[PDB]
Design a protein around this ligand. Structure first.
Ligand SMILES: C[C@H](CC(=O)O)c1nn(C)c2nc(N)[nH]c(=O)c2c1=O
Ligand SMILES: C[C@H](CC(=O)O)c1nn(C)c2nc(N)[nH]c(=O)c2c1=O
Lengths: 264, 264
């Protein structure tokens, strides 16, 4: 189905064998700290190791202005990439952050604005030859047709990326669940996720603990494991290659079961 | 999609609004007891209430020869139907057990032999006008073609039922996961469950904690919640109307999320 592997510098991700689990790093900052402090970085390394041990395939590390964001995230990327043999994604929409993170050891760019907030981010992705996740996002929830519009917005992102010199194999798409969408539009995007497959790029699904699950189940954020699981299962059945999750152990087990059942 | 409700004497089950959760009753028997003892029945009533409170829609009560089985299950059906306002299914393949259970208060027959072990069970179902679950089962794992064969075997059951005078609306089918199937054939049946929809009967999926999940995940029976969840999610996506589960709270939450996403 995929005739290439996802090339991440030192690491390679096979898109065919299994659903790839992107674990979300707890980056709880220290007050009184610019960044780089021992309790901050150690807590993050500990959590990275923990998720690595629970089945994560990628560690997503994110975030204060630009200068502070770098100082918070660079020392974390330095230590995690040193101590956890796992590809790291830099959760950022900012060109300058993206650059520093990769210089610090990050392998994948995770842009919640799909190269639209800072188009130079794609120049960054192009130059370092790294995979970039282009997430559907917009400043409004005024759709003519949700899916049709989503796909149009994702293409505008793909265009910005390719114009900058990003190779097709370095593009991952993301429906951006819980971004610029009603709880009902999120459900609708879930129900029709498979439509994103026609664009011909791997798809990452980020639904973990999100508000729409809470709207369906009427459960607070810490009571969202079962609902997250359901979204993850449906996402894998509808073809997505990555899931971005908080509960690595559990989702990793669900993904593995889904994979076996669908023949992936 | 369904133009009738599942009629269960005092209770009615809408097959359209949501995935119906059949909770599995712990029927742990007392040693030194024929049946009907206080610790036995109370433990079962307690568990029934517990599952009723966790989102179960049906209580499955099962099981010693024929005479003992009745004496174990009747007093339980008597007390549960008294104290838990929820339809009860009698998990049995035996005609005489089926009869006693309904006389005692059971609403649905759950036959793991699909009327094939004791064809008179269908006469029982016909006479009391109760829903009967016909589960795929056989004494061998020698398939020409799994799905094609399953459907043939399910039809042989439907035929026995209808010949006995069972109405179409009182027939539920079940793929019988983990019965007469390799771990691999179970996966295959999961991957192709939607094929059972053509027979035009509601479908119950019983996968909870089963051996095949353990084969995929290499986890013991108590570590099967995530995998069970995945099978439940896939089952609902492939159209099934009931799930028979041990972990009611959790599965009930997954079902509810699946339901919202698929528009059920
Ligand atoms: C807002 C939320 C916050 C978080 O959990 O850190 C979030 N952040 N990021 C970076 C994301 N990236 C991708 N690719 N897909 C997402 O669905 C997603 C998110 O939902
Ligand atoms: C063997 C197992 C034992 C149990 O959990 O009590 C079992 N019992 N029964 C009564 C079942 N009935 C239906 N309809 N579908 C099933 O998949 C199923 C089962 O897997």
């Amino acid at each position: 189905k995929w005739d290439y592997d996802l090339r991440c510098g030192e690491y390679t991700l096979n898109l065919n064998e299994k659903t790839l689990i992107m674990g979300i790093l707890n980056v709880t900052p220290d007050s009184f700290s610019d960044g780089g402090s021992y309790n901050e970085v150690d807590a993050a390394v500990r959590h990275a190791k923990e998720m690595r041990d629970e089945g994560a395939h990628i560690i997503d590390i994110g975030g204060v202005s630009v200068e502070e964001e770098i100082k918070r995230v660079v020392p974390m990327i330095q230590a995690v990439s040193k101590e956890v043999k796992l590809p790291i994604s830099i959760d950022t929409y900012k060109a300058e952050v993206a650059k520093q993170a990769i210089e610090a050891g990050a392998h994948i760019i995770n842009d919640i604005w799909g190269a639209k907030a800072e188009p130079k981010i794609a120049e960054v992705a192009a130059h370092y030859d790294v995979p970039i996740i282009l997430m559907h996002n917009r400043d409004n929830m005024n759709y003519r047709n949700l899916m049709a519009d989503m796909i149009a917005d994702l293409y505008d992102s793909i265009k910005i990326a390719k114009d900058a010199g990003v190779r097709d194999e370095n593009i991952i798409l993301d429906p951006g669940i819980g971004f610029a969408k009603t709880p009902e539009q999120n459900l609708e995007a879930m129900r029709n996720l498979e439509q994103l497959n026609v664009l011909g790029y791997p798809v990452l699904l980020g639904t973990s603990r999100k508000s729409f699950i809470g709207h369906v189940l009427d459960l607070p954020v810490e009571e969202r494991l079962e609902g997250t699981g359901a979204t993850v299962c449906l996402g894998i059945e509808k073809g997505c290659e990555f899931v971005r999750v908080h509960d690595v152990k559990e989702m990793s087990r669900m993904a593995k079961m889904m994979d076996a059942m669908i023949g992936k």
